[PDB]
Amino acid sequence: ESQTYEVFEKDPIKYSQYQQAIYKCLLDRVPEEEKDTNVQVLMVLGAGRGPLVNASLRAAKQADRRIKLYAVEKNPNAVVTLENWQFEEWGSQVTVVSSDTREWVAPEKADIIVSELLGSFADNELSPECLDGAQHFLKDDGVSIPGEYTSFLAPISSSKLYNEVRACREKDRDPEAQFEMPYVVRLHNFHQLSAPQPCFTFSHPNRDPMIDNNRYCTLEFPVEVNTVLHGFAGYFETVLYQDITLSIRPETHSPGMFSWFPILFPIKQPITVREGQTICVRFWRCSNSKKVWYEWAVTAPVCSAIHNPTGRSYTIGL
Amino acid sequence: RVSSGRDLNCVPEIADTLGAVAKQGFDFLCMPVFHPRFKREFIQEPAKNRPGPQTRSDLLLSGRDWNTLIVGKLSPWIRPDSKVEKIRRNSEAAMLQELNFGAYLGLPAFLLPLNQEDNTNLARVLTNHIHTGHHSSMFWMRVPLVAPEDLRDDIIENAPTTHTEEYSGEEKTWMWWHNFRTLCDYSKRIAVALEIGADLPSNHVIDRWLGEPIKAAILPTSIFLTNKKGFPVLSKMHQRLIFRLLKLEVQFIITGTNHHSEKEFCSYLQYLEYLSQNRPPPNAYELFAKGYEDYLQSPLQPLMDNLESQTYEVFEKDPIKYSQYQQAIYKCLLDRVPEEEKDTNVQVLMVLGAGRGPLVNASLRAAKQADRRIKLYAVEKNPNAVVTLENWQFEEWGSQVTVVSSDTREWVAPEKADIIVSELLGSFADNELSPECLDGAQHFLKDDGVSIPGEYTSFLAPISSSKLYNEVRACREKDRDPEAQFEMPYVVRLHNFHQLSAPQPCFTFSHPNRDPMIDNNRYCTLEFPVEVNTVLHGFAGYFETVLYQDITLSIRPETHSPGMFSWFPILFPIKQPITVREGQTICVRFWRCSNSKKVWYEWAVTAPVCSAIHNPTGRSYTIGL
Amino acid sequence: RVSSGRDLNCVPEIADTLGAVAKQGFDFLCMPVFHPRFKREFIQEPAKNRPGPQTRSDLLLSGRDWNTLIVGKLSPWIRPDSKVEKIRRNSEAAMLQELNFGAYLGLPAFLLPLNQEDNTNLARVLTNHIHTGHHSSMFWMRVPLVAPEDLRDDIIENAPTTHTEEYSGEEKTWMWWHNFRTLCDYSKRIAVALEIGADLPSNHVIDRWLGEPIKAAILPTSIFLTNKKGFPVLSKMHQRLIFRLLKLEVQFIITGTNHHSEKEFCSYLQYLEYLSQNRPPPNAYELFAKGYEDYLQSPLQPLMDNLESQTYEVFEKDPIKYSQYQQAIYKCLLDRVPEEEKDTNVQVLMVLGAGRGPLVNASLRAAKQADRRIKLYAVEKNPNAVVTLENWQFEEWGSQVTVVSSDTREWVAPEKADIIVSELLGSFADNELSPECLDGAQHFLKDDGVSIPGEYTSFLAPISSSKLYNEVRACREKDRDPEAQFEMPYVVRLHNFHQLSAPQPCFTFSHPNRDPMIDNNRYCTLEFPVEVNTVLHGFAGYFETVLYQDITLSIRPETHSPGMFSWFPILFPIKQPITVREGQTICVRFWRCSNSKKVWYEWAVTAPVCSAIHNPTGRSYTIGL
Amino acid sequence: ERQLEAARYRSDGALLLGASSLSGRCWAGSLWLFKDPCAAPNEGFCSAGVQTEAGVADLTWVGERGILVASDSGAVELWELDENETLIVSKFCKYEHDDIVSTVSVLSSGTQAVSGSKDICIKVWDLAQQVVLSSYRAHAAQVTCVAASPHKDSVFLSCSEDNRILLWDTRCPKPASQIGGYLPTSLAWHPQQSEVFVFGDENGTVSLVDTKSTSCVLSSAVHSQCVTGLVFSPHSVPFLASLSEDCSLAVLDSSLSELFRSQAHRDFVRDATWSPLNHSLLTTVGWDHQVVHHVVPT
């Protein structure tokens, strides 16, 4: 919805990092002897209402390089904003495309693809699938911004949060489905039991013949306290371009970026953990042609059931 | 009596092999659905484009032979928990391919091995197959009593086999299964194929499998000893384990090669049949309860509900119970009326809750052998049972018995009783509300009156049973609390379970009751010492009753009345199973609660860990007053 | 062969009466449980204090006999809808007492009469017996085809019997039943005991009972005519009704006194066995339907699911289906390749969705019959069925058949097809998603290539059936919408129903699709003229398919392919039954909806009353793409 | 029998083939002798041929006319080419293992053999007496490979899915000893340094180990999948042929560097036999039913 775009657009730090990432990339691609001859084809995949198109414009003025923009966006409601912007301000410089990046037959090939298809758990908005479908129209030496992203998990204790999830029971569904789905929450009254460890990482562009965005990860968290495990906090880190990065992982959090809150993967039953014990978690990123989902289990100090088997309570639509 | 299967890992021609296995007398065949050595590739070229049929055709056997005679097996090369990513990915596609082909075939069971500690991805892949389509088939986890790593020969110079005892470590393969079935959310389609090795482990290792859903027992040919005339036999220690498995009605599977070629392969099966025919003869309780094993039923509420005719008939078929009652009344008549008053003193006997009349006839049989005079009153609130009583009165009893159609708590009796005889007890002693019923009848008992029974005590014992816990789990219903099934007791003939500690008394009631205050409400704390590593799932409940002095009845196993098969034990479940280590104490708390309308129990576990209070305020279970 | 019972209001001695009934050949006995004339009091002194047993004892028969041979009977004096309050109050107490005694006895059925318009309090008291205690028992409502008032002799001078036809008035006893079962909330434990009289009413009156749960037919001995030999026979019209009743497997009941004195009594039963043996013979479609009557099943989704080996086996067991396909391929080859090109022309045939190869074999038999050359490609996405195809290709077919393990919409074909052949149709023609599958195969079809089938059309018909409505209602499940069961289609062999209007075409698809853009989404409005008074409960769905030219397959009743019985009709229920008056039009709307992942139907009735739109957005039911 | 399991050249250059049908209606095996290696594996152009009742998991030449086979039925079988070498007739079929015999190896003297199986056991056989001299439950999982010492009867190597590479010496009371990474899948003793051996792992890596100072000397990431075989060339400074489930043939030097690479096979490469006549000619067989004759640039 319109007001959802407005809340995510109100992040000067995020968009200045994106501008700096494109600015650096333009310099690294077009030397001073080609300042006018080489026009760079920039494709903003998932343009929204246009904050990344304006970041691409602001990065071309300070880098003094020539760019040909393509603002691809599947939401027809956001395309109305883009086409009014194009007619009144951008002009011929920006071509607004009303399409899904996975279906679009692009006329040209991109030197750089710029996207904001990430969520609080990095690949939970399905950025890998979207950028994979756009690889056919990126040049053989094309740059994806962001180039990499990694999600992070941390075991947490919170009898307040566990009770909040417990209260999300509904009619006409599994009475425990609420514990088999992630939530985006500004985590406040909780205890982080161990330091966040990386979970799933995705690199763009992706070479390896096989692709497979499916994953399986085992994590061992050393716990130095006596506590009760109720779930896992999830965060992300992203490499926009080389030293330009974004983060919601608390220890490396981008100073000022308040948009994305951490994610929370609950567990059905709280687990008692004594000091010196290790919490071992298992995460799977699963998928079929229609949906993508996560499944997860605790395997130490005690086992839990596998949560969300086959996306019975939660799936992310493809 | 013994359902048996042949386990093969080599089947050159399936029709030929099935013909030989059937000739050998086996009921079924466990075999691979794909060639066990035919490794298939799903990712890399050119191996992934391998042509030809991937396995033999479904047309080779009829649909009924596929549905009844074949048990599939996962290919040994399939390793979903491999530390190599590629092997893990290939093994996941191959596992679903084999399981799906098994489902396509309509196989009644498919074997999968637990042969290491980590089986997380194997569990995730199997859970995924269960949550896909509408196949419904059984999954048999092949799991040994002793891990191979712990039964190997001590022949590795720089890796000696530890001869020191490690109590928990010897139960490691139980933890293998426990973790696997916990990850798989206690699926009722996931069961145990217990593999029996050459040297049995300690008793505590064998006992970890009590209460577990064992569907198969795998006997390799290499475990069989050779007898006097060269036939395959088993050790006496192995034979006792066979007898336990026979009680659970497991399917025996013969694995390995023919090592008794001089006597043929059916000799292994014939020996198993010999142990089956010559198994230690069972008791009359085992003969009676055949069919009710771990079948959960609702405890009768004869106060709130009017019992049906056939329900009275099943409870009347207990010669031991009624002869004890007769003996209790006989003794009481002698103790009350001396020989010098044999005719002058008539004893007023009031049968409270007379049913169809077995206690009225016990009161008559006790007056003939005691040679005493009695005036009977058969009180009964069920108008349907009163029809039986009034037809009995008119045709046989006569003026001797007065049939009263009333509740004992409302009845304004004309006379006062010397003795009150009642059968208002349940499997948990006071669960049919006998205290409330007999309390209401105290006003019409003489100041020196005798109540038969005079006392009753209930007993609790902590139990472990993943089979019973799954049975309660299956009692979920629409339009009620999704966990209400765990907050109510069930009457069940307990079969596949483990009693973790000796029964301790819970609640006791004495009749007549003097103490000014009465209060049938109770609170009890019980501490059960546990000497084993186990999982607590609930508590078994029993009773003991004093009919009159040395004449008593019991369903507490250790003091059970020889022959009394009517009342089965009760079971109080718990919502979440509790892990208990050897040397720990299970502390349970029981409350008997009540208002003017209903009576109920509430219960909590407080050690080694706390549970929630079960059935607070009778939200899931109440007994109607 | 005919399950029969004897109705008596006089049972002097229960065992002697039972023995006599059993000697005559009856399977059961309907009798009173209290003496029919024994009026009882519950409120007033002194008649309320009446002593003795209130009825016969339960100890007179074994529980097995009470459970299988006795049908209880409400006492004829019990009147809970009396205009006199005292009688209403006594009748409520006596009605519960009798029903409760029948429940105490474990009787399998209990008869209650509907012999007047108002039975409101009778219904309330029965509902309250059903909501008290432990159930299972059946309630048979004794309701006449013709009310006693409407069949009385015209012998009252100042009260003549009406000679005017009253269309709805003649149907009044159906409304007696309907109001009663509406008040009792369509209890599955409440069925009809239809009473037949000497004179049968118009066919419309008899037809009112189509789709009702008739469990018994009461034949009084006074309705039997006497043949020349003294034997009891029935009129040709009564005989027609008996054949109709045998189709529903009702239990026949003989009520009344023996009126064929010198001709014994078992003669009424002998006549029923005579009509049963000499009934119009069941056809081949009735032979196969056995056991599947009104049993609801989920329609198969072969695109979303991989069909099992035994599912493929039942759908191959249709010789009519494949002889039609062979004839359509044979005729097509002749039209495409002239005799002069017989040896130089190779026809590229592609079977799309080949299953286990029955269409490949039919293509092979058609190319040989026509003397034409064909190059075959067997496309199949189910990898388990591909195993069967590849073992067939190696053993028998050879290089002529190229087996393609793929989804037809993804396959990159190495050549174009002259003919595409498929059996991707379901019971409602496009419900398995044949449009989307064949559209995906159009790019590799020659610009002049044929599709077999080339066309298919689904049909709908409004139906009445309170039996099917109650079967759908019982499909309520936990963890879902409590009404989802009414918003999804079922494959069901329709048996106890009333078709209320001739089937009309709903959606039609053509292949190849010459229409550009076209869209497989549909919206259809249908107007069904209704000539009877009824209750609509849903719509039966059928199909017709044109394989090639005049070679067709159909399950639409009037154009049904004789012998093809693999496909049963579909049922699209509605949430609430709708009253339909004679002469009214039923107007239904149907949508075929979709997105990139799913396809589903939505439907609503817009006349004579609206319903909610059913299955909006595939909330309760979708077909997987 | 489409799946070629083994290829072994005898002294004169006759090629022995072992094969099985790992799919379709029948799951049986076959033994073949080709006195003309160029006509392999065409059944109409062979010298000797036999159909075994179960599949062939492994085989080894026993001298010049004997063939010891590891069967799917759990049996160790010995076949024998007659006087004319036109028939391959069975001499002994002993079912002593309780599952698929996966590996077989003739010990130095040619009088004894070591069998390995999926039943976790390692058995020592007296071929002439046709009996089992010793059975060792040493591993905790399927025996993957057993390789006898080129010169000592009491010395041999074993590897298994329990991650153990065992160096055996039956002269000790505890015969086996653990040797110093993924699961071990193949073993090959060096024909010159008889106190050195190579092993292949399930991750594609090939390692060179020294028996005395056992701590692994050199390793190379040769294959992208499981190493099925390691075979040494007849040269005085031998080359190592490594074969894999990645469907490729590699040829390494003494520093484990790739000199030759053959991606001729379209399915798994199962065996590799260097010709006694031309030491630069190496023959590999595979599950694609191909007999590929290579010319290694020596």
Ligand SMILES: Nc1ncnc2c1ccn2[C@@H]1O[C@H]([C@H](O)c2ccc(Cl)c(F)c2)[C@@H](O)[C@H]1O
């Ligand atoms: N496969 C696809 N092809 C074309 N567009 C696609 C997809 C998938 C998503 N999107 C669009 O990406 C945007 C992004 O998520 C975003 C941008 C900006 C703000 Cl501020 C924001 F909140 C969210 C949204 O506008 C989505 O509609």
Ligand SMILES: Nc1ncnc2c1ccn2[C@@H]1O[C@H]([C@H](O)c2ccc(Cl)c(F)c2)[C@@H](O)[C@H]1O
């Ligand atoms: N307060 C009350 N006042 C009068 N009668 C009362 C009560 C409460 C229960 N009862 C009756 O006691 C009997 C007893 O439980 C029983 C007896 C015999 C058999 Cl075999 C049997 F199964 C059960 C039942 O017949 C109940 O109806």
Ligand SMILES: Nc1ncnc2c1ccn2[C@@H]1O[C@H]([C@H](O)c2ccc(Cl)c(F)c2)[C@@H](O)[C@H]1O
């Ligand atoms: N898009 C697709 N591409 C390739 N195959 C596809 C589809 C969609 C369905 N199918 C197959 O069509 C067959 C047909 O429904 C059938 C054939 C024979 C019998 Cl007897 C039977 F019951 C069912 C099934 O075997 C399905 O697997």
